[PDB]
Amino acid sequence: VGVNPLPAPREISWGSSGPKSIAGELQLRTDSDSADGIVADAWNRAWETIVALRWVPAATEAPISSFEPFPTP
């Protein structure tokens, strides 16, 4: 998995069922937001960031490469 969210969440477990497309626009659903709409407001900012950035992971985890060994004749 390319993404590597910071901070490392306590417990995170990824599947192998393949990628999940976002169907156009992710819609928030809650009947339990603070009266002043903090969850709604935070969501709107996150979603607008997600859609404007279309983030492409810039660095990703890998095993180390096979560097060519120092020769000895």
Binding site: N4, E11, A59
Partner: protein
């Protein structure tokens, strides 16, 4: 596979206010066949965290669409309830867009405390209604935080689950602002700080000045300024400061030296107590839920007060684990900010001028690190703390359980001698992301091994994210190292660190 459409959020109680120790935990789930990203949080504040995690999972599919790469199960919560950075606006002013920018990075890394060091000897940038005259000591009319400026900072922070915890540093680091109210509530402010002639020194840093701990009216003004500020800052915590009490400064006050004459049994420890036993009541007086923070010096410097209430949170910055052990043993709740690991300002030489210590045209000793060759270059807390230094800090090492549970978190201070809008962000970021993980989820892998090498690509990517999000974070390596993972490691052995 199924396509995602909705985000479902259930907050258990929508009433919990943004205050120390509020339940910040959440769960986030994406299932194969489910068209819904499921988020559960104890509070609104945990849900806010889910969103900042969530945006770091949703990436481009390479064809103008978005994906989460796999289904996923996340359960997550902060190891410590106090995860912070400290902004110094006393030494140099920082504008609101740039304060907003730090709060943005804070949000994406889940830091929940902006410790704001508002004033210092050098300036008083905050408007006070009761004493409009204090801001006469701001750097200019444009470099002032209006009442409304503070409300917007607090709100902008609240929207991102960040508590703003103010600091007016008393009784030391006090000259500017104060002395426009009453010039006799400050002493030695016209002294020479005198580190060229060390015995007569009134300060560690130029622009000397301290509050006259004896003078009647000191505590009225302090109380009025404090009460006004307390009202505009909705956190229950408040930072009174109390660091670096210089004994020679009081010699310039008739009062304090007359007070020493009256009874020559009186020492400087007594003088500190006097402030404690007069100032703390005034501060505790404000509110029922009011908690205090102060720098450790008050209860652990050379000239410390005999008895500091175990009620006051102690922010430790000296001697690393040693001083953390001392305070935690004596029943103090402690904020870790040890200078040897977490002071972000270090490593930029000295800022003091007319300084002949730089004027050495040859290495005076090649075998030992010295001032201009291997040594500090005039930064007392040198070297520069790299993100690794920060991430490696095991701040509960060799402590007991009863001790360890007195640690409430950490704060990385950025002192502002050589910091204004121009570099505040590159000094904070991405290194504060290293702290952010250290006090969120720690620096250990599943087996307890130190996972700094795993943090490499995470923090490197996170830096580029921060930049994508408006936060002007410093580059940490040649970009070749991001694209060639571990190609810039010093050891191939991924177990090198322990």
């Amino acid at each position: 596979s199924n396509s995602l459409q909705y985000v479902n959020v259930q907050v258990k109680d929508i009433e919990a206010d943004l205050q120390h120790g509020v339940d910040e935990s959440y769960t986030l789930d994406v299932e194969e066949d489910s068209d819904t990203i499921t988020i559960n949080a104890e509070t609104v504040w945990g849900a806010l965290h889910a969103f900042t995690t969530l945006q770091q999972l949703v990436i481009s599919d390479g064809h103008g669409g978005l994906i989460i790469e796999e289904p996923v199960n996340i359960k997550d919560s902060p190891l410590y309830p106090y995860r912070g950075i400290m902004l110094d606006t006393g030494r140099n002013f920082v504008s609101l867009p740039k304060i907003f920018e730090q709060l943005e990075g804070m949000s994406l890394s889940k830091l929940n405390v902006l410790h704001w060091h508002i004033d210092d000897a050098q300036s008083w940038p905050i408007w006070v209604d009761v004493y409009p005259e204090m801001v006469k000591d701001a750097y200019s009319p444009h470099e002032i935080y209006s009442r409304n400026d503070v409300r917007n900072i607090v709100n902008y922070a609240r929207a991102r689950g960040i508590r703003v915890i103010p600091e007016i540093d008393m009784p030391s680091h006090s000259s500017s602002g104060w002395k426009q109210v009453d010039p006799e509530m400050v002493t030695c402010t016209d002294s020479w700080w005198s580190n060229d002639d060390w015995p007569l020194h009134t300060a560690v840093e130029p622009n000397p000045g301290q509050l006259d701990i004896i003078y009647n009216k000191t505590y009225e003004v302090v109380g009025n300024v404090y009460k006004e500020l307390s009202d505009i800052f909705p956190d229950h915590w408040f930072h009174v400061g109390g660091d670096e009490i210089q004994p020679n400064c009081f010699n310039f006050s008739t009062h304090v030296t007359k007070w020493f004459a009256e009874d020559p049994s009186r020492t400087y420890h007594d003088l500190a107590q006097y402030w404690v036993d007069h100032a703390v009541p005034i501060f505790q007086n404000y509110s029922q839920e009011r908690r205090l923070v102060m720098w450790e010096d008050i209860a652990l410097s050379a000239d410390n007060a005999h008895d500091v209430p175990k009620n006051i949170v102690m922010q430790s910055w000296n001697n690393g684990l040693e001083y953390i052990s001392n305070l935690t043993a004596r029943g103090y709740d402690v904020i870790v900010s040890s200078s040897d690991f977490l002071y972000l300002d270090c490593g930029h030489g000295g800022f003091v001028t007319n300084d002949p210590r730089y004027n050495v045209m040859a290495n005076p000793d090649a075998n030992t690190p010295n001032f201009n060759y291997g040594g500090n270059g005039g930064s007392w807390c040198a070297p520069y703390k790299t993100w690794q230094r920060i991430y490696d800090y095991d701040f509960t090492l060799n402590l007991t359980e009863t001790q360890a549970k007195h640690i409430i978190g950490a704060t990385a201070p950025l002192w502002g001698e050589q910091v204004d809008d121009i570099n505040v962000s590159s000094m904070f970021w991405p290194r504060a992301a290293a702290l952010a993980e250290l006090v969120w989820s720690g620096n250990r892998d599943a087996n307890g091994n130190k996972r700094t090498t795993e943090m490499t690509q995470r923090i490197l990517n996170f830096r580029e994210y921060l930049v994508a999000n408006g936060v002007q974070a410093q580059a940490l390596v040649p970009k070749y190292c991001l694209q060639h993972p571990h190609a810039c490691d010093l050891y191939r052995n991924q177990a090198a660190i322990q």
